[PDB]
């Protein structure tokens, strides 16, 4: 169809599936594997990628072009990575990945939406694909094309350091959420197959459903480890939102690291190929975790070379190496030479990832469009983000007794207020995990309004704003407030750092909710990735808010505290008394809540 030199696999007019058999015919065995080869950026130069005919690449979490960088400099990146791709023989083009997983959050002055637990509270699907929707232009904004999100993780144990990731622990509320899906990816047409790969072209991304499959069954809510339940519950609890995002066309597939009943994810062929490739008719790329394949042995790290050998002979297709990839490629060249993994596996595995990046438009635009640079942190998905950080609160209680007052909503006219609280001022705190680094971090490490701020903007002209961090009870009822807004919670965590037996908050924390609740009226506004040990809180607090992390738009908050607009949220998690309960879920024999799953008391705008 024309030229002398056409070649099929470089024809956009071209059925995807014509497209892929084109290309995977005239490839080699090292251009084969080096599509199932994603590494870090740090260890990636254009030699690097020419040579070992790389097809992907990541950013983990922190993992950045510089502290504070533009989106200029991170399209100009990820341009010179592709520009080395697209330098080999066949020019097949790198897909580049990233945890964007409540907004683009590894990137400097990205808005930063509530982690999923806070979105369960919304019960709003619709509001959760606009965040998708608004996610996906951020990424594209950077030059990214594939956001390793949605985590549909069901979490059955909130000592689990990633319980925030997870939208509920009731796996109707996680399946609406996969609305997730079609806002980053774009919609699917009307005669569409289920399991198909879609992505609608370049203002939207790849997406992820993480981590296949029960990683939020797992025992004591340990990060990475034993999920011991039959069948039938594997099926009812932990599955079902992958058929979800099957119907809605989910590009990828990542990985868990856990086992179900002794077997590592990682080489479980039964469901990697037995049960989501051949039942559910997967047909995108399944996506290893990071060091994922290493981490089947016991020590990690110990037999690459089964590794190797178990994960692609379960299933997987790519392979997020991320470091050791002359290794990874020597091993896997070495399993094939030997017919130990036989070709039609790697065919397989090229199949799904090109059909994912002829199926995006990837190879029809596989460079970053410099007009797209203005969407980060685009004022309006801040009022966006700001919508759902308001949704997502969820007010525990409302007086001290039945008798008393409505603390909430607070008047913005006063002569003078005190917010409190280490918290209230700190913009790392309520973003938490995965923002800007892996872990989050303290302080002012990126844009965004914190709760001081957010109160500062919203009261009257004549309200004067005190804030202390840490009030003693005595400088409290001196001061002359009419009122006080106290914030405190969990530091930011992520995986096995925030895995925690005692889900007790850091002090000062209830100490100081003490001594200004003791001067003066209070409300209390709790952030945390899960529930924590609140009875004392309660006791100390007129008025108590759960909002969970809410991210960068403080205003968020402050809208339902001023009555701009009422609580609305419900706890898509139960809440229980003590972490001797735990796990505590529905149906169990011993379910005696402090506060049941879909609790929240609600105020009217004023
Ligand atoms: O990010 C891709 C997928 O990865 C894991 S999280 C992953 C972080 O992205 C990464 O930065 C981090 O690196 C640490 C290594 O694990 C350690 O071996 C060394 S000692 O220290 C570095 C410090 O950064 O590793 C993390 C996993 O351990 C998630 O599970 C996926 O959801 C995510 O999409
Ligand atoms: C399946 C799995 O990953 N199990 C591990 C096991 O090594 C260890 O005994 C346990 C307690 O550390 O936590 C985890
Ligand atoms: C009062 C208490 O024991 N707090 C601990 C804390 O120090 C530790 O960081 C956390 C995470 O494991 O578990 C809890
Ligand atoms: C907490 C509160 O005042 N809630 C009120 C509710 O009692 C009332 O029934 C409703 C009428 O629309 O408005 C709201």
């Known amino acids: 169809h024309h030229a002398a030199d056409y070649v099929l696999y470089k024809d956009a007019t071209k059925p995807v599936e014509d497209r892929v058999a084109d290309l995977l015919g005239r490839m080699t065995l090292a251009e084969k594997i080096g599509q199932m080869t994603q590494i870090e950026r740090l260890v990636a130069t254009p030699d690097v990628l020419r040579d070992n005919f790389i097809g992907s690449l990541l950013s983990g979490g922190g993992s950045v072009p510089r502290k504070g960088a533009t989106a200029k400099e991170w399209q100009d990146m990820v341009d010179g990575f592709q520009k080395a791709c697209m330098s080999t023989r066949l020019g097949i083009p790198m897909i580049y990945g990233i945890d964007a997983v409540h907004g683009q959050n590894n990137v400097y002055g990205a808005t930063i939406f509530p982690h999923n637990v806070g979105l369960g509270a919304t019960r709003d699907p619709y509001l959760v694909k606009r965040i998708g929707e608004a996610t996906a232009l951020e990424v594209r904004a950077t030059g990214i094309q594939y956001a390793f999100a949605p985590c549909i993780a069901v979490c059955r144990d909130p000592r ?198 002829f199926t995006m438009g990837l190879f029809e635009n596989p460079y970053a469009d410099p007009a797209m640079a203005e969407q980060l942190g685009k004022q309006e998905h801040r009022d966006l983000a700001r919508e759902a950080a308001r949704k997502s609160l969820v007010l525990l209680k409302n007086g001290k007794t039945s008798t008393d007052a409505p603390l909430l909503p607070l008047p913005k006219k006063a002569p003078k207020i005190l917010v409190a609280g280490s918290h209230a001022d700190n913009l790392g705190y309520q973003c938490g995990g995965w923002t800007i680094e892996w872990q989050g971090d303290t302080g002012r490490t990126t844009v965004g309004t914190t709760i001081l701020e957010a109160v500062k903007a919203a009261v009257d002209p004549s309200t004067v704003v005190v804030f202390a961090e840490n009030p003693d009870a005595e400088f409290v009822k001196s001061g002359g407030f009419s009122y006080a807004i106290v914030a405190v919670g969990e530091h930011p965590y992520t995986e096995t750092k925030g895995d925690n037996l005692n889900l007790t908050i850091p002090e000062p924390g209830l100490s100081t909710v003490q001594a200004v609740c003791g001067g003066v009226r209070c409300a209390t506004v709790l952030i945390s990735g899960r529930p924590v040990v609140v009875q004392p809180l309660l006791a100390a607090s007129d008025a108590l808010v759960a909002a969970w992390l809410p991210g960068s738009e403080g205003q968020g908050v402050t809208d339902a505290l001023f009555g701009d607009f009422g609580f609305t949220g419900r706890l898509p998690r139960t809440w229980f008394k003590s972490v001797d309960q735990l796990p505590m879920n529905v149906g169990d024999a011993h379910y005696d809540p402090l506060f049941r799953l879909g609790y929240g008391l609600t105020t009217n705008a004023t």
């Open 160 to 357: 689990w350091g990633r319980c925030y990731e997870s939208y509920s622990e009731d796996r109707r509320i996680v399946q609406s959420m996969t609305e997730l899906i079609p806002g980053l990816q774009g919609d699917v047409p009307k005669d569409f197959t289920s399991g198909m790969p879609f992505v609608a072209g370049k203002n939207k991304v790849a997406a992820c459903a993480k981590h296949f499959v029960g990683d939020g069954g797992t025992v004591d809510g340990i990060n990475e480890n034993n999920t011991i339940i039959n069948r039938e519950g594997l099926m009812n609890i932990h599955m079902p939102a992958y058929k979800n995002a099957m119907d809605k066309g989910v590009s990828t597939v990542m990985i868990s690291y856990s086992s179900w009943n002794g077997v590592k994810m990682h080489a479980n062929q039964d469901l990697v190929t037995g049960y989501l490739k051949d039942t559910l008719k997967f047909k995108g790329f399944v996506i290893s975790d990071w060091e994922g394949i290493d981490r089947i042995t016991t020590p990690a790290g110990s037999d690459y070379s089964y590794s190797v050998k178990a994960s692609i002979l379960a299933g997987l297709d790519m392979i997020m190496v991320p470091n050791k990839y002359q290794q990874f490629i020597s091993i896997l060249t070495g399993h094939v030479n030997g017919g130990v993994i036989p070709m039609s596996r790697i065919d397989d595995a090229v199949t799904r990832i090109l059909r994912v990046k």
